[PDB]
């Protein structure tokens, strides 16, 4: 009778719902992991190559002519368009440092916005990591409490009557930790991996700014 | 975000202490 | 969506019990 | 004998008081959730709709003209008419960089102020999510002490005569975790909603600064020609 | 008898010293709470009254004429006269960019120094909120250990010989939680109250920078025209 | 901040307490 | 019949076998990272400290290049000097100097960040293993303990004679968890200290390059005036 | 007997080793506390006097004349010399904003370097505070394991012969926490004492920047 599967089937409905809720939370934290691991791998793999192509660039118009080969989903092409658009909107200006300040502000906000867009699912991982121990312990305490109500009702001294109830209660802690540990680890992996990706994207945005900054100073110098 | 994302373990240590003390009272009486 | 199908597949197997 | 209310009522005055305390914490941690979630939504929807209209604007003058139909409680109108106010109070100056630094500073201070005003309730949620299992554990430990005093006075030896006392005790911790779990998920929902919202408001504030900054530089060029 | 005070009387010297140590940490937590809560209600109620009077100002001279009625210990007057002093030390200089820079730096330094001084007590509360549950835990370990001494000395299984160790472990847990709960609550309410106050004082200091920056522009424009 | 880890972590004491719980359950009745 | 600290692994449950091999894998990877890091990190810091002390003599950026010219293509100090020199030889047509100073500051800031970000390579493992290994040990012990309560329930019998091997397995999972966690925390804290020291030393070389560049440009501009 | 000394004397060599390792950890965390507390007291007492005297200054030359008799170890005299040394490296420069920026960058580097340099032994306190609980727990788990291996190989089952063996195991948790709590308290105290001191030193460095920046632009404006 008392396999681990039989131990679930004989337990109280409250702790059975706790076990099912922790199994579903486990399915979610693994579905988020397989979803995002592939996505961050593809974006990291692409962006690292776009940076190698742009490393050859000497002026912003040449960086545009390189980046026109990049797909319309590419983040480096997006940044370069965020820079080029601040030029075309400013076409009447004789002040150049206003173009530099406005472009730096736009690109810094774009890098932050992309970095935030990476994080969409992480609220589930953070929550499931934080609450799964507590949901497990509620299942354990409820099972233990229910067993002592059993002893009060059946008025029987023998602790061997409590041993099944203790196993059923400890299983809720075990399943609680099996839901918690992957979620806490994977949240820390993605938090570090997003920080690494934001920094790589910032290094591309910095090259766009450096290219524009030389290009404007050379053009303003060559005018006199 | 100040999202709570980490296991604060002390509640557990203390609920396991409760579980220990409960049986450490009841078992030598049984 | 493969992620959720692959997740429920790897769990389904371990939850055979 | 019973398994829930039979033990709750037989329980002593401090376990009663602790269980009432956690039930009061549960109701406030759900009132905050219903009270905030309808507002945060009306804020998120209204600000998102305003940003989608303002994103078309090409000058701060045009942005004022399209924002003027927004309600008096509009966050974006309350930024646009402040960038206009900073330019109006400064009208005797010819220092465009001086107007830009003052407006940038004033807009940042207001974006932070709306951020503080959206996050008002989170102090309760963050506290209740941290303390409530320990408050339950105190109720349980004092319940065990009262059961232990109870045996040490009558020196009983029947496991069943202790069983109802130790049960009640655990209920306190069970109620402690039931108060804790909602407060942690509800806190994380609002922590993530605040992060997204302050950033979305920050992008509207940034558009006001970009429109003003570009408009001043073009106006100075057109004057000097 | 076998009462809770009899349970304290019977406990080992190490557990008495844990209980007495945590009771002293508890009473000084409440002493510093009653002291700082009054001092945070006084300063915040006063500062709210300043900002509301000072928000009328349209020149730095009018801001001084409003602030002159404020008391010697008024934080806003103590920010106005920093901006005034940086101008009066600098009358020989026509680099208004330098006057604005030096003033902004002094005012940023002073707002940080007031926040830094206001936080004095928080280091104690933050220590007790983290440490006191583990000081409790050490007393529970000592109680559980003394239980095993009791059976090892008597080779007998009964409740009455383990009883001193259960008694000690319960008291060490209860007093450990009674120290921890108010310390972590009070640390949160003061961290919230300081975060609000320091930002509100920043919003008063910002108004001083706006008024000074505006005055120097209007003066420079009038001198050029 | 320095990014080092200095927190009091006592997690494995739960493991000791499960074993003590077993000792009382098995030996004491 | 009898058992040993190997025989109990040979007699352990699948889950507990799998957990113990899992923490043994965590143990061998943390020691592999310690040797992989420390042999390189000692040599990198020992190099950079010699470069910093040798460049500290310099009075101009040309004098720093004449010192650095034989530090070896892998020297971070030569890499920063040459990559600051690279901004001048790209800006040759610029009569504006503050743009060169600004761009060089921005380039060197990102190179210092990138080299620090590259040296942190192993810390994801060390922080994860140090924080999470005791929870994996706790899961392993809870499974062994739960199985021992099933052994009680199955046999309807109660003696240390049948349970002692079961708790010996459950403790061995915890002991292996502690043997994995302790080195990982020690190794993480020594590398956090050493990284912080190296980051500041590298930032000081980067600061020396900016100071040398800016002072030389400002003096060349004055000599040309 | 079964006193604390009797338990230490009778214990297994590994648990006996863990007790000695934790007592050495207790000794070094107190030796660090008494070594550093007198240096933080002397640094605060001296620096507060320097800041109280320098508050009278109205030019950088007057601040040097006030500072002239400060001891050669003094952090305020070090900061005045860092600023003075920039002016006499920069002698030919007409770019006063260049001098201000170079000086501001140097004094920020110096202030950060002092605060980093004086927080030297906080790695031992952090490490001892983090691992002390564990090593002690490892001592208990090893002592408990040896007890049962004993009972499992010798049958004859009774809690009375295990009881002293698990008491002298539990003692290594007690010593493990006695090593932990001082170290985690002291590390938290020193993190705040460094934070307050680094800020006070920052306010002296700020006065040097204010004195330089003001008297530099007054002298430049008076030359008109």
Numbering used by the authors:
A (entry chain E), H (entry chain C): 9 to 232
B (entry chain Y): 12 to 41
C (entry chain F): 10 to 26
D (entry chain A), E (entry chain B): 9 to 233
F (entry chain Z): 11 to 39
G (entry chain D): 8 to 232
Show passages lifted from the paper.
We have solved the high-resolution structures of the E. coli TonB-ExbB-ExbD and TolA-TolQ-TolR complexes, revealing the inner membrane embedded engine parts of the Ton and Tol systems, and showing how TonB and TolA interact with the ExbBD and TolQR subcomplexes.
To eventually detect structural heterogeneities and/or TonB binding at different ExbB, we performed an additional 3D classification step with the 227,384 particles that yielded the 2.8 Å resolution map. In these new orientations, TonB was found to bind ExbBE (18% of the particles) or ExbBA (13% of the particles). As deduced from the TonB-ExbBD structures, one TonB subunit associates with ExbBD via ExbB chains C, E or A. The upper panel has the D-box bound to the ExbD periplasmic dimer in one orientation, leading to the binding of the TonB TM domain either to ExbBE (orange) or ExbBA (blue).
